[PDB]
């Protein structure tokens, strides 16, 4: 059935503005990550910002057409270092997450959108993993385990692939002489 004058068509459109939002600020936290020599975490904003730019979409191409007026409260601000940029983005996703999604979600079925609540619903979930990222990439700066971890493992050079075995990531790399930010932990995934 159609959406206008529900109170979901403009949960959707609010959930719109914030996530088109998000995807700005995750660019510039990206960018900033790398003034401050963090590489891996630069990817990781600008691929989370991409992905802020789909869950926008998929809840965009639910609007049947028309202006409307919505009122909300969003961050004025800010560009700090790449830890706070961290801890306040994962405050975002928290907040998305917990209240924002779940909330629609619940209205958006009261009102007899099914689909769109199941919508809301796994969109919240990729959130949660979002925040998880944002925490986990913060501690490590925190404690100072970017680079440097306890035992000896395998590092990766972002920008050339080389491999470097050890308890931390190489000052420059040996193949294309990039600075350490470019390394990250070794991973596999399949
Ligand atoms: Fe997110
Ligand atoms: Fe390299
Ligand atoms: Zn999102």
């Known amino acids: 059935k159609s959406l206008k004058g529900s109170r979901t ?8 503005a914030g996530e088109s939002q998000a995807r700005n600020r995750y660019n510039y936290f990206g960018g900033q990550a790398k003034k401050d020599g963090f590489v891996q975490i630069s990817d990781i904003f600008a691929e989370t910002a991409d992905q802020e730019r789909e869950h926008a979409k998929r809840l965009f191409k639910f609007l049947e057409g028309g202006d409307l007026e919505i009122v909300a409260a ?13 801890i306040a983005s994962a405050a975002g996703e928290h907040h998305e997450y ?27 979930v ?3 993993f ?55 932990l070794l991973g596999i995934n399949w």
Not at 9 to 16: P, V
Not at 74 to 86: R, V, W
Request: proline share 5%.
């Open 98 to 124: 917990t209240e924002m999604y779940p909330s629609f979600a619940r209205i958006a079925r009261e009102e007899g959108y099914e689909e769109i609540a199941r919508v809301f619903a796994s969109i919240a």
């Open 130 to 184: 979002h925040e998880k990222r944002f925490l986990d990439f913060a501690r490590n700066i925190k404690e100072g385990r970017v680079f440097l971890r306890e035992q000896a493992t395998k590092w990766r050079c972002r920008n050339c692939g080389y491999v470097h075995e050890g308890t931390g990531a190489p000052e420059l790399c040996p193949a294309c002489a990039h600075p350490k930010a470019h390394f990250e």
């Open 126 to 128: 990729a959130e949660e």
């Open 74 to 86: 969003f961050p004025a601000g800010i560009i700090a270092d790449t830890h706070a940029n961290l």
């Open 9 to 16: 068509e403009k949960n959707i459109l609010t959930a719109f």
